[PDB]
Amino acid sequence: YLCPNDWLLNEGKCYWFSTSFKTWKESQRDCTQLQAHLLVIQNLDELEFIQNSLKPGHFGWIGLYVTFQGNLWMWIDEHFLVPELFSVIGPTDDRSCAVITGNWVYSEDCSSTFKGICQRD
Amino acid sequence: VACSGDWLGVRDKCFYFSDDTRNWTASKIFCSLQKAELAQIDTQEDMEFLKRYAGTDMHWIGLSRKQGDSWKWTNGTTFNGWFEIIGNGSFAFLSADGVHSSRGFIDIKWICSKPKY
Numbered sequence: 110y111l112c113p114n115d116w117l118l119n120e121g122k123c124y125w126f127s128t129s130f131k132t133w134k135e136s137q138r139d140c141t142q143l144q145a146h147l148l149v150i151q152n153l154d155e156l157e158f159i160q161n162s163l164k165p166g167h168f169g170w171i172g173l174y175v176t177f178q179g180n181l182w183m184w185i186d187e188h189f190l191v192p193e194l195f196s197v198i199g200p201t202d203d204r205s206c207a208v209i210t211g212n213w214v215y216s217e218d219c220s221s222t223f224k225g226i227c228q229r230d
Numbered sequence: 231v232a233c234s235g236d237w238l239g240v241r242d243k244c245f246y247f248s249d250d251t252r253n254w255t256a257s258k259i260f261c262s263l264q265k266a267e268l269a270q271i272d273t274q275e276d277m278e279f280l281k282r283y284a285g286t287d288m289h290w291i292g293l294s295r296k297q298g299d300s301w302k303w304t305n306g307t308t309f310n311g312w313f314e315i316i317g318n319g320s321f322a323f324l325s326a327d328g329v330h331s332s333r334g335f336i337d338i339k340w341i342c343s344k345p346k347y
C-alpha cells in the first residue's frame with residue numbers, strides 16, 4: 110500500500126497537503142485531478158493524525174461545508190457531521206466551508222484561497 | 231539601541247516571530263503587552279525579510295478591514311496598497327508565498343513590529 114513522493118499514510122488512506130492556495134471548490138477539484146478528494150475525516154483516529162501532522166502556521170480545507178438550506182455542516186461523502194467528532198469555531202452560515210488547524214476546526218469564507226488537504230485509498 | 235534576545239532587529243524596526251498559535255485579536259493584544267502592533271510592514275525591504283523568515287509558516291500582520299469598511303493597520307491609518315491582499319477576508323496573514331485574508335478565528339502564528347526607538 111502506497112502513494113507517490115510527498116504523500117503521508119495513515120491506514121488505507123493517502124494524504125497530499127497541496128502547496129498552493131485555492132478557493133475551496135478549486136481544491137476539491139485539484140484533488141479530483143489526482144483521483145482523490147478533499148479531506149473527509151472518517152473518525153477520531155483519522156482526526157488525531159492530520160491534527161498533530163500540522164505544524165503551527167499550517168492548515169487547510171476539508172470535505173466539510175455549510176449547506177445553504179438547512180444551513181448545516183456536511184461532508185462531501187454525503188453524511189451529516191456530528192458533535193461526536195468535533196465542532197467548527199465560527200459563524201455557520203451558507204457560503205462557509207471548513208479548514209483545519211493543528212488544534213481545532215474553524216469556519217471560513219469558501220470564496221477564499223487556502224492550501225488544500227486531499228485523500229483517497 | 232537594538233532589540234532584546236527574542237526580537238529580531240531589521241533597520242528601524244524590531245520584529246517578533248511567534249512560536250505557538252493564536253487568533254488575530256489574541257495577537258493584536260500580545261504585541262500591545264509589549265507596546266507594539268501586529269508587524270505592520272511599510273518598506274519594500276521589510277517585505278522580503280518577512281516572507282523569507284516565515285516561509286511555509288503562516289503569521290498575522292495587523293492589517294484588517296472592519297466589515298466591508300476598509301483595510302486598516304493596528305496603529306492609525308488607512309492602508310494604501312503597494313501590495314495585493316488576496317483572500318477576501320478581514321484579517322491578513324503572511325506566508326513566504328504571499329499574504330491572504332481570513333476571518334481571524336484560525337489559530338496560527340503572528341509577527342510583531344514596533345519602532346526600534
Ligand SMILES: *[C@@H]1O[C@H](CO)[C@@H](O[C@@H]2O[C@H](CO)[C@@H](O[C@H]3O[C@H](CO)[C@@H](O)[C@H](O)[C@@H]3O)[C@H](O)[C@H]2NC(C)=O)[C@H](O)[C@H]1NC(C)=O
Pocket residue numbers: 253254255256333334335
Ligand atoms: C481570540 O481568543 C480569545 C481568547 O483566547 C477569544 O475570547 C476572549 O475570551 C472571552 C471569553 O472566554 C471574551 O469575553 C467576552 O465574552 C464573555 C462570554 O460571553 C462575556 O461574558 C464577557 O463579558 C466578554 O465580553 C473576550 O471578549 C474574548 N476576547 C475578545 C475578542 O474580546 C477572542 O474572542 C478571540 N477573538 C476572536 C478573533 O474571535
Ligand SMILES: *[C@@H]1O[C@H](CO)[C@@H](O[C@@H]2O[C@H](CO)[C@@H](O[C@H]3O[C@H](CO)[C@@H](O)[C@H](O)[C@@H]3O)[C@H](O)[C@H]2NC(C)=O)[C@H](O)[C@H]1NC(C)=O
Pocket residue numbers: 242270271272273303305306307310
Ligand atoms: C501608522 O503606521 C504606518 C506604518 O508604520 C505609518 O506610515 C509609514 O511611516 C514610515 C515612517 O517614516 C514611512 O517610512 C519612510 O521613512 C523611512 C524612515 O527613514 C524611510 O525608510 C523611507 O523614507 C520611508 O518612505 C512609510 O513610508 C509609511 N508607510 C506608508 C507607505 O504609509 C503611518 O504614518 C502611521 N500612522 C500614524 C501617524 O499613526
